[PDB]
Write a protein that binds this ligand. Structure first.
Ligand SMILES: [Mg+2]
Ligand SMILES: [Mg+2]
Ligand SMILES: [Mg+2]
Ligand SMILES: [Mg+2]
Ligand SMILES: [Mg+2]
Ligand SMILES: [Mg+2]
Ligand SMILES: [Mg+2]
Ligand SMILES: [Mg+2]
Ligand SMILES: [Mg+2]
Ligand SMILES: [Mg+2]
Ligand SMILES: [Mg+2]
Ligand SMILES: [Mg+2]
Ligand SMILES: [Mg+2]
Ligand SMILES: [Mg+2]
Ligand SMILES: [Mg+2]
Ligand SMILES: [Mg+2]
Ligand SMILES: [Mg+2]
Ligand SMILES: [Mg+2]
Ligand SMILES: [Mg+2]
Ligand SMILES: [Mg+2]
Ligand SMILES: [Mg+2]
Ligand SMILES: [Mg+2]
Ligand SMILES: [Mg+2]
Ligand SMILES: [Mg+2]
Ligand SMILES: [Mg+2]
Ligand SMILES: [Mg+2]
Lengths: 386, 67, 136
RNA sequence: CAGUCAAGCGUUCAUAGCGACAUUGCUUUUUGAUUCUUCGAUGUCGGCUCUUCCUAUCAUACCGAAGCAGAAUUCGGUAAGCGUUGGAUUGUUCACCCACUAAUAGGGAACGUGAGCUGGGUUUAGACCGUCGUGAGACAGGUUAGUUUUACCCUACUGAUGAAUGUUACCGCAAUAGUAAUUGAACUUAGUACGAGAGGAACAGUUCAUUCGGAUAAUUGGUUUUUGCGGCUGUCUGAUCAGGCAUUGCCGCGAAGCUACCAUCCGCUGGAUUAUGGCUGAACGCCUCUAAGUCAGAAUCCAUGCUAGAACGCGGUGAUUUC
RNA sequence: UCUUAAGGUAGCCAAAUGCCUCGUCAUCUAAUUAGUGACGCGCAUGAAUGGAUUAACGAGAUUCCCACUGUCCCUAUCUAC
RNA sequence: UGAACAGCCUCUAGUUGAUAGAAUAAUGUAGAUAAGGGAAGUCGGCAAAAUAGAUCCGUAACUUCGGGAUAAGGAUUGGC
């Protein structure tokens, strides 16, 4: 017979399979549409998720009850040291999809980037790009020819860049290498830009701007094998249920004599790649600056790093991007930040944001103070002090 | 913004921190954390708890401010 | 909310499912209110309709004058006792649940209010705001 | 459940909406008829949980017609994408009420689903009553108590490794499969259009909210074997300090982690169409959205985007072993 | 008025005994096929086949109320095996 | 300790026997805690929670006068 009472589904059928992602770095499956009129610039960036914090900003929205009145929101902070442009690759369109035809690398590679090419760096001759380095040392024979080959073809040009993992508090020591499409114009100008930027660094403030409406791409936090009740949010069986109750009662009817693909079942939860959209940037922080957490109203020399450092991460010595909302993935994970695909006015994506105060209290508990100066002022002197 | 003062322990309360309690007689009590709130729910006298600002002021500890 | 709802309210945590009994905060002579429905609530399997501060509910009186018993009437919740987050960032709650009796248009049956009321409810029902002593 | 004719109803008026006397049909969610399969056993009602499908569409999208001034309402079309509730009584399916809601539409999948649950009913053995029987006993008459077994096998599903493709590593492409967002309210429009008055909208814009989904832990709450700090009982270590035991002795607080519409954030825009309304224009010198041609258009379809990446699909790139 | 050997008296009831039946009225609830109190031409109650009450007692059957609580809204976390 | 051959700890005496090691996924069995609400769940408050000792106060209807009755409902409890 029919279902006694109608109810919506559990979970989303468009997010299958809930298997582990291919790699720890999520891959950008689409880039902003290219307009061959603006200058050549990156369309994405690489960063690391440090932690979340609390922000105080005056909401400005004509019509709302809190118009021109103060509100409190939660944001996440992403460490973004500048990336190194090492190599570009061209893509030529084919009736079978885009195909990469050639790759041109830089003459010199740092230690941290080529460690990606070794599963055992400590016992190795470290002969990476050594004969490719010998492709240089003559003016342009093997390199300028490949660049011209890219120019004659390859309607889409992407740039291979890698993170400076040594600047972060992480002890991974291995850089992350990724591709970013250039959305300038005149692909010859694109490859000229790329070649000029070989062995050169690019700071995040050259890509993203305040109030810009951006997107986050990262692998979510994994949780191992998970029961159906938490994996899909199904109703728990009553208390007096034999043979367990954290299950699904009926997994299918008699016919078809098979288990449907749409029935919630136990399996690995999390560690999936997700693309989260519409997250407004609030502050573009500079690591070469004290008082990172100081606003025009706070005016106290304090960095974005809380007391005792970000939980499980450390400090933010580098430049950072602090975006409203929460982004997928936990702390210490590589995250890829992307420009928005479409122009969104929405009268909230055009909102101008000016911060007031940054919660720099220790996240290791019910933090009371924001600065050791403030702690000393409040508590007074102690036995440890002299 | 304005930084609140804990009704129980006197500790400074920053925005979005702690819980606010309105008693039936319309008096408001702000607690910086769950600890102070729970102690308040047990009718503990702030003057008897050794780490509250009221206790320290009443017992003349670090009171070198006023001469 | 509904007919007398002058304006909109941000979402606040639901703390009063149906079957809950709350104190009567007015002078109409009712002692308590029995919730049987919430105006503007959605529908879902096995999800109990829940009431929050300032929502108009379909309520019934269990204790009071006999003229108020044995009949259903609209009501407006004025005290929650469950913490909810205001958009200024603070979590606040009263010590008990409380409501008042009103007509479908929001005109309060009683004339006075005992104890404080939530600013969210007062801002939304002008008649409740008029008769309220202390508003927070 | 749906048609065909049209004597009448409808102030006139068959067909706005109905429609008698007749007649043609469809379905197998009723109940019948039969006994084809199963009596060396296919676990029978109902409820709970869950998925998908059908459309004879309750609401939402877009339209057509009215005995459509407005509002409300009725009939009909494309439409199954999306949703269709919380309770009182009854074992109930069914039914009747209370209330909210945009709505509380109808059905199938061995009258879906018991090695998924329950056992309230029916339907063993105990027992009571009424009627019947002389009696043993009978009663789709009533009542009460009455054991719910096994999956380690194959397949399916969910996840998880994996040989061979000279080796290894890195960066990619995208065939194919899946797909998602949904609905309401308030303000303004506007007491305006319309209406004698009574009453009384909509288009655009704004703030939110319902249901659903994916994340996340800055804050709040929960969680305590951090056995982290403190306190308390009985006993033991001669006393003190410090400790053992009481299956974590008990109580208060309690970081980290996990976690909650009990917490916060986010949830895209293009084309082609359905119904329908149009253009030119014959057939048919007139006329016609149609025949050739053609314009706009729905929550529809395919795309953008999102998810896996063929473990026998593919590309680029680095290095490629010396007693 | 026919008729039996006598024609259900005292009592009691939609009761564990009533098909119609979810009987009718009142109360109980926002809403009750439940419960209780009444009515009784009672298919088919009824007197040691024992009738009617009945304090106390009951791992007996049923209804409501107060306190209580993860039974539930709506799930989450912790320990041992 | 305590009313107590109750439960808990110890003395004499007797054992240290029950296949072990390594991790801490799902579902389990056993033990628990949960904000707001409080039976709305369910055939049915099933299960669980709540009360609990002692001292003092107070204790209804009904009744076979014996009970009901620890009725109900309150207050106190340590150490010196
Ligand atoms: Mg079914
Ligand atoms: Mg259905
Ligand atoms: Mg979740
Ligand atoms: Mg069982
Ligand atoms: Mg923390
Ligand atoms: Mg806490
Ligand atoms: Mg249910
Ligand atoms: Mg047969
Ligand atoms: Mg047979
Ligand atoms: Mg057989
Ligand atoms: Mg079978
Ligand atoms: Mg149709
Ligand atoms: Mg059938
Ligand atoms: Mg089965
Ligand atoms: Mg029997
Ligand atoms: Mg017998
Ligand atoms: Mg006989
Ligand atoms: Mg029989
Ligand atoms: Mg496809
Ligand atoms: Mg916690
Ligand atoms: Mg024409
Ligand atoms: Mg008899
Ligand atoms: Mg003694
Ligand atoms: Mg003893
Ligand atoms: Mg053994
Ligand atoms: Mg129910």
């Amino acid at each position: 017979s029919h279902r006694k009472y109608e109810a919506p589904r559990h979970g989303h059928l468009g997010f299958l399979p809930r298997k582990r992602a291919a790699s720890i770095r999520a891959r950008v499956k689409a880039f902003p549409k290219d307009d061959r009129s603006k200058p050549v610039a990156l369309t994405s960036f690489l960063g690391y998720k440090a932690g979340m914090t609390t922000i105080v900003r005056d909401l400005d929205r004509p019509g709302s009850k809190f118009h021109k009145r103060e509100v409190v929101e939660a944001v996440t902070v992403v460490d973004t040291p500048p990336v190194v442009v090492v190599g570009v690759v061209g893509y030529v369109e084919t009736p079978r999809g885009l195909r990469s035809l050639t790759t041109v690398w830089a003459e010199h590679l740092s230690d941290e980037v080529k460690r990606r090419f070794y599963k055992n760096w400590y016992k190795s001759k470290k002969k990476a790009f050594t004969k490719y380095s010998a492709k240089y040392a003559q003016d342009g024979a093997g390199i300028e020819r490949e660049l011209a080959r890219i120019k004659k073809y390859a309607s889409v040009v992407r740039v291979l860049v890698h993170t400076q993992i040594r600047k972060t508090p992480l002890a991974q020591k291995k850089a992350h290498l990724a591709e970013i499409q250039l959305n300038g114009g005149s692909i010859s100008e694109k490859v000229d830009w790329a070649r000029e930027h070989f062995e050169k660094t690019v700071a995040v403030d050259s890509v993203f701007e305040q109030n810009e409406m951006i997107d986050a791409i990262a692998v979510t936090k994994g949780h191992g094998f998970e029961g159906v009740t938490h994996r899909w949010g199904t109703k728990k069986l009553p208390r007096k249920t034999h043979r367990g109750l954290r299950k699904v009662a009926c997994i299918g009817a008699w016919h078809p004599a098979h288990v449907m693909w749409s029935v919630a079942r136990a399996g690995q939860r999390g560690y999936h790649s997700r693309t989260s959209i519409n997250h407004k940037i609030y502050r573009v922080g500079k690591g070469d600056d004290e008082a990172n957490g100081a606003t025009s109203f706070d005016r106290t020399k304090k960095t974005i790093t809380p007391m005792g450092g970000f939980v499980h991460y450390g400090e933010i010595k580098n430049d950072f991007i602090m975006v409203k909302g929460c982004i997928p993935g936990n702390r210490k994970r590589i995250v890829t930040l992307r420009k928005s695909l479409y122009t969104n006015t929405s009268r909230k994506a055009l909102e101008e944001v000016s911060l007031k105060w940054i919660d720099t209290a220790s996240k290791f508990g019910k933090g009371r103070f924001q600065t050791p100066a403030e702690k000393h002022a409040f508590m007074g002197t102690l036995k440890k002090d002299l | 913004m304005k930084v609140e003062i804990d009704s129980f322990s006197g500790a400074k309360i920053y925005p979005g921190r702690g819980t606010l309690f309105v008693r039936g007689d319309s008096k408001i009590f702000r607690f910086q954390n769950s600890k102070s709130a729970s102690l308040f729910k047990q009718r503990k006298n702030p003057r008897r708890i050794a780490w509250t600002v009221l206790f320290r002021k009443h017992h003349k500890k670090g009171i070198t401010e006023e001469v | 909310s509904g007919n007398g709802a002058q304006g909109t309210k941000f979402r606040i945590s639901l703390g009063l499912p149906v079957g809950a009994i709350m104190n009567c905060a007015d002078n109409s002579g009712a002692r308590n209110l029995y919730i049987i429905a919430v105006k503007g609530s959605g529908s879902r399997l096995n999800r109990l309709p829940a009431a929050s501060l300032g929502d108009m509910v379909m309520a019934t009186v269990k204790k009071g004058k006999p003229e108020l018993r044995k009949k259903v009437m609209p009501a407006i919740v004025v005290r929650q006792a469950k913490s909810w987050r205001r958009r200024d960032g603070v979590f606040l709650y009263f010590e008990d649940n409380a409501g008042v009796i009103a007509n479908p248009k929001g005109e309060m049956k009683g004339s006075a209010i005992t104890g404080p009321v939530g600013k969210e409810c007062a801002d939304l029902w002008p008649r409740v705001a008029s008769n309220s002593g202390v508003v927070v």
